[PDB]
Design a protein around this ligand. Structure first.
Ligand SMILES: Nc1ncnc2c1ncn2[C@@H]1O[C@H](COP(=O)(O)OP(=O)(O)O)[C@@H](O)[C@H]1O
Ligand SMILES: Nc1ncnc2c1ncn2[C@@H]1O[C@H](COP(=O)(O)OP(=O)(O)O)[C@@H](O)[C@H]1O
Ligand SMILES: Nc1ncnc2c1ncn2[C@@H]1O[C@H](COP(=O)(O)OP(=O)(O)O)[C@@H](O)[C@H]1O
Ligand SMILES: Nc1ncnc2c1ncn2[C@@H]1O[C@H](COP(=O)(O)OP(=O)(O)O)[C@@H](O)[C@H]1O
Ligand SMILES: [Mg+2]
Ligand SMILES: [Mg+2]
Lengths: 445, 96, 76, 438, 433, 432
């Protein structure tokens, strides 16, 4: 978090309340049409009423596609799930590509569960049965309640409980002076150790003595837990915590992703629907971002057709900087973005354009501000001129070496000489390619 | 131990932050193998019928003058493993 | 139900890998994976460098007479 | 509140929309047009419902966006949950855990259901009083008595030791409406007829009550157990198969196990124990199968346990994967002889407009007639799916400007914001050098 | 019973002299092929030759699989017949040669006499004997017997929760203890016990029954390679940790051969050589064919029937080597080729009528002629597959028989491969790829 | 004596030979020439040392023998052993156990070090008496050289003491928070003069000082190690075996959050390092595509790369790219070019190698060897150094002369002479 990454300046989409894109806001410069389309897509995500919709960010490299996707993620917030993914990740040695894609799809669909957990804490001060003056059956003594006195830091309360709790109390070996907690939703007593006021400095127990609970005896709170469908699927496919031989085998064996069946996924969907109907949980459909979609092969694209046609799928964002390239896994089949035309028919294409020199200068200034670097106007103009040739990434990547060189030279700002020296020290892609071409005989292969 | 799961670890009590982080609803959405077996008891009773055509004990290695320490070591290993693992295999008795 | 397969081999074959202790070195001086879960950084770094035995101490303890019997507890 | 299932591509299709004579209506149950293809789908659906002929294969072939997957989803929705419908993609059979033939076999056998119908004795009533007496110390025989009540009966039951243990585990109290199966002794609580005593603490908020059951106490109810052939194979393959039912990881099931299961199911069917419910396997984009998978399909459709197989492909004369041979639809002619082909014709203007109207009704979007005309023109020019996407895009744009009806301006705005394949390809040609490869 | 593609094939339709009747046993033509298949059936019944391979060659739809299933039906249900497709050797668990060898052993069956020892009765006394043995008392309607059993049987009895009064079944051979229920005599003691009652066994406590077990060589190999008969912890551990198939060694197969030979010599076993059928042999690769060379040259191998519809085609696994049936000439030198021919329109009409009878469909003579004409073009398979949809149309219209109008309507609704090819060629620019 | 580390191809390099202004000296710390490249390496090293910016990529490009691996080793040496430096080859990411992206993720997470600091109160002493009354309650007596006390035990403490078979004379430490007992050793007495000792028992002196002590442990681990530890129940065994598999992304995110929590709590510090991939041209297009977005994370180290390829074919594709690397990744990285060496630089490198190997050479021998190195290659001359040293020692000489160099030049062939001799007898060799 403290370290500055390449998209550390993107705090969202700089959109007006009417959806129009401001020239420079929220860390984004230019790309007004793409930003407006991404805002429409953000509204679509927030509407939560569409499934399997796909958006493709298409444009030359270094044109803000990943920045736009991260701006979408920032606009949605941490509540909305956002599962980034590169196309190379589908090639796994454990599960098939379709399984990886399905798992990421289920990772993007989130579920938020709201529940109230009511507990009674305290140190047991009193344990007195409530006998009845008329014993049932004539002989012996009958009891109708068990009075438990619970003491905390700022109070003491008595709880008239069901007589059946006597067995749980004996099983937990609860005696006077012990700290216990009783859960309302289950009616069970759990002994979380003994109070520390009865412990001496000469005792050696570690987890036996516990501090007296603070606060009130009756504690209730609302617990909000955010989970994804993939979390439930994996937790049910390879369960952890059992005491049977299968759980022991799972612990022993090397963990391995498995092909989760449609039966388990249907059961999870049914449980989630039941929870939603009960009012416990609220569905939070998020976004799956698949960067470098062109690295997927023809099998992945074909599966993606069925994946997107599903009614449970999230909203998928693709990104490709390829032209009329050959689809991987096929022999001499060319498609406009490296994506077969069948999948391109299922997506909405957002075009990202190249940046004018003014926009490049603005982006350089913003990146310098984010990295804590003061740059002079002449140095900024020289770096923008360097960015007119070469690329924008080269210019934003010369900022920190130049700052280091200035600091070594003893200056708090980047001057033009520092940028010139850095340009002399480091070559760009075009200059290196020219050097290689001029000496193609001396290099290898 | 349960890293990245809807099931939280065994919190000592409400004093621990983990007590108020996880819900019982999330816990009830994850089924242990024993719960799965209890859920499929009728299916196991009605649909598990396939028997191997042949049944044999594992092949045995015989030598005229074996090292007198191999057999007691193997016997102790098998005895300890059986004493530690057979109680955990009782739920699969009807399947077996 | 079939009887098992009785595979008979020479008794000399089962001793092929066996090496007499006088013919092999102690490999426990290179056992790194066996130390995990049993030896701590405290033992290796702070305790053992300070409280390693010396030949002089060992000889002194061995040669010295038996220690006096431990006194019985007294409620005081 | 939004359920886990939301508005998808085929969310408006509730069935094929046919009449008794399998004559397709122009617009019913979401389906529009494709009259000949829908009639063929209805005939195939009747063949599936009859469930008498095993291993029939149908190929839905047509241009992209002609409603092949729409027709398949309509057939699936018209079948109903009683009949199995396994829908997979062609790419899904390529697995690192099992062979292609094993995956195809499992896909087939997930589409056949075995149903076992038996009658059991069931006790359902309201607990009036339960008493359990147990020894104070040491192992002993617990003695108990349970009272159950309906609207017309009340009987006092003497309880055995195992029923006592079951009741103790279930924590059955007075007022709990419980179900008891006499054979297995299983007890299932289904509610409380009234609240517990108020004087007790730490009890929680009482939920709603359940009315006491009527009629006799010990009734006779029909219990139905339904599993697929794949589930039987998995749980019989190995001891851990029941966990493999959820984790996958079945590996390759031995052919001996499958032969035993086929023989046993045939014996059960002869002995009236179980009924076979053949279903459908839908392989979308079957052109991704290789020559070996097609060759396996050739002989796997010849079994009496095979379901009806429905394929969809939009390929012309194309090279078969794994070979260098060009074949229609990417399928070998030997398999093409074993299947009937259903062609889908392209949609006209009125069919496109009706599809757009149904989609707008499904998405709760109100659109003007001029907007419908413009959107239909766009769909004819670009594609149907592009127009469907622009539907929602224009709905959102209209909602942004605090409107109520989607106008032509919103459609033009979303046409400007989002591009089709043609305009994207044109703009990429304009900047060909900027894009990376070719 | 569901009707499959070959449900009408009941035999080869041969006379006593071996000649082929024109229409008999669900077969219409292929008289020479049927006579050859009869010779092969007699060869299989002779049980003298080993590893004799036969190749059924011809175009699709000429009844190669029909002839193979007719051979299977002629042999009978006692003789093993293992049908495998060539695409099934590409497993992710074992090598292709291992799959071929396993199917080879699957084709050889063995009828072996076995005696089962059964202890069945109601438990009256369950006294442990401190490893702790058990002394158990069982009673039936014929007598009472007390038995001393191994500690494993005691563990099984405990796992079954067997207590005094329960009816139990013990198999002494496998040590398999099954608790059947609490004795019926105690069903009146309580009103809700959560028990399944059983009457008292009416035979003897100890019984010996002699039964015939039908097993194959592959079953013995699997049982001795992935053992699960010891009922020890190690067997369970091996089953759970190593569930995948393994490459069974030639040593295990030699040991099983010796054991089976000993059983046959003792007179308690009978060998049934059986048949293996590989349908799409062209789907095998050159490594599989090379292995099959030596496998067929073996004196243990069964009779293998091969089928192929390929013409002069490139063998899989080779770059550009082309062979007459997709089969290298070395393997073709080791096979006897049975050639199947295309059917005349009369034979097509006969087959259509037979299939209609099999599916319970009444078809008029005009409709039969029209469907045979439809089958003259397109293929026979397409013509046969239109019977059920036409029957459904006739049933919808209230007619109990198929008329020519129903066939015409169905043919209009459903296209064939050639019609679809024509449509694709006419509209090549509109379809993908 | 001969230790496991011996004279290698880069044993003479101890650093980059730069001053405080990152100006390269002509010959310092074992590096000759490559002034611009060494200055660029120093700039990159300062960027690494600051640690503020994440996911910076540098490509060291040049002709073979121009010092790319030399510069990388100089950077690794100049960087302290405190900062992690994972050096892998391009071929090492092709594993049969984990995917290429998983291998690259593990390499990335091995390059970020997490220094942990745990302070724990412990009791440390020698056991005097253990009395257990009837496994219910008991007393334990512990002593030092200056102290002795008795403790009251509970049920779990008694169970832990019985499980570990703790007896009298044992020297033990007890963690107050968790109660776990580890045995340091046992005290030596006249009655414990065993003739045979077990493989784990060892005699230690009774601890001095006070029975209650605070234990401070500071160690450096990588993120990948924490991932492997928390992957499974005994995952630390995979830190030795390497049978890690593909770690779940959710586990990695949880561990990242926990590490941030430790960093906030003051219990851990982050030391981002360097991942050096030598001969990157062996990476496939999938690996490059993964690297494109892996560098964009906030927990990505500095990626230094080195290739000697010209405009060549990218592995896994049929396209030609300037270094074998797709231009999308090349736009994300700064390229440091190495120039070919001159005669003076070659002679200075030969002098450094001779000094490293402890070989004395005459000036005429140096001239001849420099001429050979310019004609054939620098590495050939470096090998001829040792060859001529061996020949000189064989004839009982002390200084390598021109005769020794000529002899080893005739004995050992470079690539050109061997290729010529093969062309003379081309038909003799197989599969031309
Ligand atoms: N319009 C923009 N406004 C602000 N920053 C941008 C913009 N476009 C790109 N950047 C920044 O410049 C860098 C270029 O990367 P990027 O354009 O995201 O690559 P790609 O084009 O492959 O998505 C990124 O770190 C991004 O944060
Ligand atoms: N005849 C039709 N009636 C109703 N909706 C249709 C029809 N044809 C296509 N659609 C809709 O158009 C969208 C794209 O059609 P689809 O069936 O995916 O084409 P394809 O046949 O190529 O799969 C789907 O959402 C589908 O619901
Ligand atoms: N001579 C025949 N008599 C009756 N039915 C036949 C005959 N030949 C083929 N059939 C039927 O025609 C269909 C095609 O037969 P099949 O053996 O699958 O062809 P092939 O094996 O040549 O591909 C099968 O369902 C079979 O029952
Ligand atoms: N500037 C230099 N200073 C010292 N030694 C060098 C220098 N450049 C190259 N070398 C030596 O030359 C040899 C080959 O160079 P190296 O960097 O390892 O491979 P390459 O540069 O061909 O990738 C190495 O043994 C290295 O010690
Ligand atoms: Mg489709
Ligand atoms: Mg190098």
């Amino acid at each position: 978090t403290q370290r500055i990454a390449s998209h550390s300046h993107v705090k969202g989409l700089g959109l007006d309340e009417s959806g129009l894109a401001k020239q420079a806001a929220s860390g984004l410069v230019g790309q007004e049409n793409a930003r407006e389309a991404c805002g429409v897509i953000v509204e679509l995500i927030k509407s939560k009423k569409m499934a399997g919709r796909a958006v493709l960010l298409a444009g030359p490299p270094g044109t803000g596609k990943t920045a736009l996707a991260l701006a979408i993620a920032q606009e949605l917030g941490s509540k909305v799930p956002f599962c980034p993914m590169v196309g190379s990740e589908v090639y796994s040695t454990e599960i098939k590509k379709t399984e990886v894609l399905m798992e990421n799809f289920r990772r993007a669909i989130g579920l938020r569960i709201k529940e109230t957990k009511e507990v009674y804490e305290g140190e047991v001060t009193e344990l007195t049965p409530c006998e009845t003056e008329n014993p049932m059956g004539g002989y012996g003594k009958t009891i109708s309640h068990v009075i438990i006195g619970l003491k905390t830091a700022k109070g003491t309360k008595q709880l008239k409980l069901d007589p059946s709790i006597f067995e749980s109390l004996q099983k937990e070996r609860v005696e006077a002076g012990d700290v216990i907690y009783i859960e309302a939703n289950s009616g069970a007593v759990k002994r979380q150790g003994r109070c520390d006021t009865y412990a001496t400095e000469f005792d050696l127990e570690a987890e036996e003595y516990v501090p007296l609970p603070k606060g009130d005896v009756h504690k209730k709170k609302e617990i909000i837990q955010d989970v994804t469908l993939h979390d439930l699927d994996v937790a049910n496919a390879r369960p952890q915590g059992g005491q049977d031989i299968l759980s022991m085998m799972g612990q022993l064996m090397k963990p391995k992703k498995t092909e989760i069946t449609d039966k388990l996924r249907g059961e999870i969907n049914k449980v989630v629907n039941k929870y939603i109907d009960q009012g416990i949980a609220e569905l939070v459909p998020g976004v799956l971002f698949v960067d470098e979609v062109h690295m997927l092969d023809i099998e992945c694209f074909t599966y993606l057709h069925r994946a997107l046609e599903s009614s449970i799928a999230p909203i998928v964002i693709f990104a490709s900087n390829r032209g009329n390239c050959v689809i991987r896994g096929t022999e001499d089949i060319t498609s406009p973005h490296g994506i077969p035309l069948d999948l391109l028919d299922r997506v909405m294409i957002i075009r990202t354009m190249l940046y004018t020199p003014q926009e490049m200068k603005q982006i350089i200034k913003i990146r310098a501000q984010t990295e804590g670097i003061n740059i002079s106007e002449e140095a900024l103009n020289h770096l923008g001129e360097i960015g007119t040739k070469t690329t924008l990434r080269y210019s934003v990547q010369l900022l920190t070496p130049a700052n280091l060189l200035a600091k070594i030279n003893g200056k708090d700002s980047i001057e033009k000489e520092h940028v010139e020296e850095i340009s002399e020290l480091f070559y760009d892609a075009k200059s290196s390619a020219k050097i290689l071409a001029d000496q193609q005989d001396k290099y290898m292969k | 131990q349960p890293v990245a799961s809807p099931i939280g670890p065994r919190s000592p009590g409400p004093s621990h932050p983990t007590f108020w982080t996880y819900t019982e609803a999330a816990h009830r959405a994850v089924l242990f193998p024993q719960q799965r077996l209890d859920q499929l008891s009728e299916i196991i009773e009605r649909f598990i019928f396939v028997m191997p055509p042949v049944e044999a004990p594992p092949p045995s290695l015989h030598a005229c003058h074996p090292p007198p320490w191999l057999a007691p070591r193997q016997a102790a290993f098998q005895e300890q493993l059986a004493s530690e693992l057979w109680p955990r295999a009782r739920p699969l008795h009807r399947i077996v | 139900i079939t009887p098992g397969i009785c595979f008979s081999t020479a008794s000399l074959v089962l001793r092929a890998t066996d090496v007499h202790p006088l013919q092999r070195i102690d490999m426990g001086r290179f056992d790194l994976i066996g130390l995990e879960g049993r030896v701590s950084r405290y033992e290796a770094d702070t305790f053992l460098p300070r409280h390693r035995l010396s030949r002089r101490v060992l000889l002194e303890v061995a040669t010295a007479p038996d220690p006096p019997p431990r006194p019985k507890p007294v409620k005081m | 509140v939004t359920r886990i299932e939301r508005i998808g591509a085929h969310s408006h299709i509730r069935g094929l929309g046919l009449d008794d004579a399998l004559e397709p209506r122009q617009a019913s149950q979401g389906m529009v047009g494709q009259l000949a293809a829908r009639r063929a789908a209805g005939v195939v659906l009747e063949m599936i419902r009859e469930g008498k002929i095993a291993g029939r294969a149908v190929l839905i072939a047509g241009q992209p966006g002609t409603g092949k997957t729409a027709i398949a989803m309509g057939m699936a929705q018209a079948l109903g949950p009683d009949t199995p419908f396994t829908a997979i993609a062609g790419s899904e059979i390529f697995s690192l855990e099992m062979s292609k033939t094993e995956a195809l076999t499992q896909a087939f056998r997930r589409s056949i259901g075995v149903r076992i119908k038996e009658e059991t004795e069931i006790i359902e009533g309201e607990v009036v009083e339960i008493q359990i007496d147990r020894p104070a110390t040491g192992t002993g025989s617990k003695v108990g008595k349970l009272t159950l009540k309906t609207t017309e009966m009340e009987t006092i039951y003497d309880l055995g030791t195992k029923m006592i243990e079951s009741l103790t585990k279930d924590k059955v109290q007075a007022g709990d409406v419980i179900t008891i199966d006499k054979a297995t002794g299983k007890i299932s609580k289904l509610g409380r007829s009234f609240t517990r005593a108020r004087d007790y603490d730490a009890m929680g908020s009482q939920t709603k009550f359940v009315q006491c059951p009527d009629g006799e106490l010990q009734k006779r109810k029909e219990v139905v157990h339904t599993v697929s052939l794949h589930e039987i194979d998995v749980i019989n393959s190995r001891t851990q198969g029941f966990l493999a039912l959820f984790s996958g990881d079945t590996g390759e099931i031995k052919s001996e196990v499958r032969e035993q299961i086929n023989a046993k199911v045939a014996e059960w069917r002869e002995e009236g124990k179980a009924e076979i419910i053949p279903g459908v396997l839908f392989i979308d984009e079957v052109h991704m199968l290789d020559i070996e998978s097609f060759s396996f399909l050739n002989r796997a459709l010849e079994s009496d346990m095979a379901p009806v197989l429905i394929m969809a492909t939009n390929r012309g004369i194309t090279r078969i994967r794994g070979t260098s041979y060009q074949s229609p639809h990417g399928i070998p002619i030997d398999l093409l002889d074993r299947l009937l082909i259903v062609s889908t014709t392209p949609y006209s203007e009125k069919d496109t407009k009706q599809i757009l109207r149904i989609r707008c009704e499904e998405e709760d979007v109100e659109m003007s007639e001029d907007a419908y005309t413009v959107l239909t023109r766009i769909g004819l020019e670009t594609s149907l799916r592009y127009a469907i996407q622009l539907i929602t895009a224009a709905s959102l744009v209209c909602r942004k400007r605090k409107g109520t009806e989607v106008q032509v301006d919103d459609i033009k705005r979303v046409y400007s914001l989002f591009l089709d394949e043609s305009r994207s390809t044109q703009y990429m040609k304009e900047y060909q050098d900027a894009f990376l490869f070719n």
